[PDB]
Amino acid sequence: LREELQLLQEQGSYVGEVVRAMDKKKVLVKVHPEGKFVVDVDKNIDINDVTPNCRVALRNDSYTLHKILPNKVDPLVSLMMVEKVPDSTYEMIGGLDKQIKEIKEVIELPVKHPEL
């Protein structure tokens, strides 16, 4: 509980996109309301991992890049990726066995066994 409280009182960190690395010690980032910033990188964070357009987190004091964070996705596009799969089944499709095999020759065979 005390550790949670102490982590809570720490200032919230900005989140900014990445244009490109610049020095192996500095990163060009772009925060939401202000413009670009050439900022330092945290010791643990490796430069070869911060790729352009990767939505890093910067400290609120010196804008230091301290986390890589998940990549940005247009909110509207992310809603197009299904999470809860539907309930339809191949056994619930009647009379389309040939069609099912034909489509699975493209949707199942290549991804499962590209070696063929």
Binding site: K26, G35, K36, F37, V38, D40, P52, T64, E105
Partner: protein, 398 residues
């Protein structure tokens, strides 16, 4: 100057057969890559000056560094700089900055606290433009194109030969063609030819969709086009490929359509970049479109687009070449007579031949065979070729 950033490519390993020669060449590639890895790993490991220079300069400028827009140069060390919030500040220019680099409108690195000019940001390239640059050259080469000898020759004379052999052009007095539109029915090899020339070229290559150069905000479309062409200028020998120019190249017309007028403004900026006031320099443009008749005449006119390369539906010899190329990696039987597929008038294109080969492979896999036969190809022809509905009139003409 900022010379071309040509895409990197590994040497082609041939034969493509699963033989020991391919193993030896690939292992030579692995050997040299391991040599490079060993050298680049032991270089910094044995590194025991300029550290004082860095500890002074970086400490003086400090982090983070704000990025502002230079507006005025008042004194030799004072400048009016507008921050990204639009607020102007009269700040000082520190000594460790090249005064010749400072120009009005340039992107300038300022201190976070006093906003004083600590440096100048060189690139400041729009991320939507730096993604257009090609880093990994496509694997398709001129050896993967069957037929199309005239088209390949024209494109080589346009965008390839001037780079390697400008002697002919300079000696005779021609300015080499600096604009090519690859037009024809879909699946004929336009994008394939663009991939091949990108693979072969030693100049920087920019790939555009003809639709990613279009932006939400009102003035960002033409501005993005200008940024793309300026970047092409920076890396002097450049090739700008705009696939599906139909998206913006459509004919100009008068209507309210508040978005369409911005569309036309973007295309107008494009044609200004191609041929307008001030020279364009040593940057070639390759444009591809299925429908050319719908393009604006001022865009495809000579001087802007010097050559119009037609990609017709392949003929018998060309189709035979496509089949030979695309079944090269296959294991053909002895009963296969490809000729029957090449003849007849199915109006099949190179993409159609590729799909025929793929579907013949799938048909062979259906019969658990790793080697294709004539019957598999015959089945694949009818299975895949069913594209057009009628396309023909009745028995009126004798």
């Amino acid at each position: 100057t900022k010379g071309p950033d040509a895409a990197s490519k590994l040497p082609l390993v041939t034969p493509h057969t699963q033989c020991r020669l391919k193993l030896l060449k690939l292992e030579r590639i692995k050997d040299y890559l391991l040599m490079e890895e060993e050298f680049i790993r032991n270089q910094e490991q044995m590194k025991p000056k300029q550290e004082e220079e860095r500890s002074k300069v970086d400490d003086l400028r400090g982090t983070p560094m704000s990025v502002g827009t230079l507006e005025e140069i008042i004194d030799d060390n004072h400048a009016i700089v507008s921050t990204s919030v639009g607020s102007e500040h009269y700040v000082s220019i520190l000594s460790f900055v090249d005064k010749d680099l400072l120009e009005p409108g340039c992107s300038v690195l300022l201190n976070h606290k006093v906003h004083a000019v600590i440096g100048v940001l060189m690139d400041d390239t729009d991320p939507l433009v730096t993604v257009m640059k090609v880093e990994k050259a496509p694997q398709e080469t001129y050896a993967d194109i069957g037929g199309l000898d005239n088209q390949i020759q024209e494109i080589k004379e346009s965008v390839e030969l001037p780079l390697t052999h400008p002697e002919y052009y300079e000696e005779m007095g021609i300015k080499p063609p600096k604009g090519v539109i690859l037009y024809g029915p879909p699946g004929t090899g336009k994008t394939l030819l663009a991939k091949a020339v990108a693979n072969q070229t030693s100049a920087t290559f920019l790939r555009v969709v003809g639709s990613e150069l279009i932006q939400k905000y009102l003035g960002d479309g033409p501005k993005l086009v200008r940024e793309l062409f300026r970047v092409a200028e920076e890396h002097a020998p450049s090739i700008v490929f705009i696939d599906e120019i139909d998206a913006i190249g459509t004919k100009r017309y008068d209507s309210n359509s508040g978005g369409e007028r911005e569309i036309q403004r973007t295309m107008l900026e494009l044609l200004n970049q191609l041929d307008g006031f001030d020279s364009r320099g040593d940057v070639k443009v390759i444009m591809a479109t299925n429908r050319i008749e719908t393009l604006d005449p001022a865009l495809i006119r000579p001087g802007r687009i010097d050559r119009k390369i037609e990609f017709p539906l392949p003929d018998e010899k060309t189709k035979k070449r496509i089949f030979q190329i695309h079944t090269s990696r296959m294991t053909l039987a002895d009963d296969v007579t490809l000729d029957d597929l090449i003849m007849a008038k199915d109006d099949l294109s190179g993409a159609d031949i590729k799909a025929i080969c793929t579907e013949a492979g799938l048909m062979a896999l259906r019969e658990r065979r790793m080697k294709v036969t004539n019957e598999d190809f015959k089945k694949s022809k009818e299975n895949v070729l069913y594209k057009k509905q009628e396309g023909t009139p009745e028995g009126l003409y004798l």
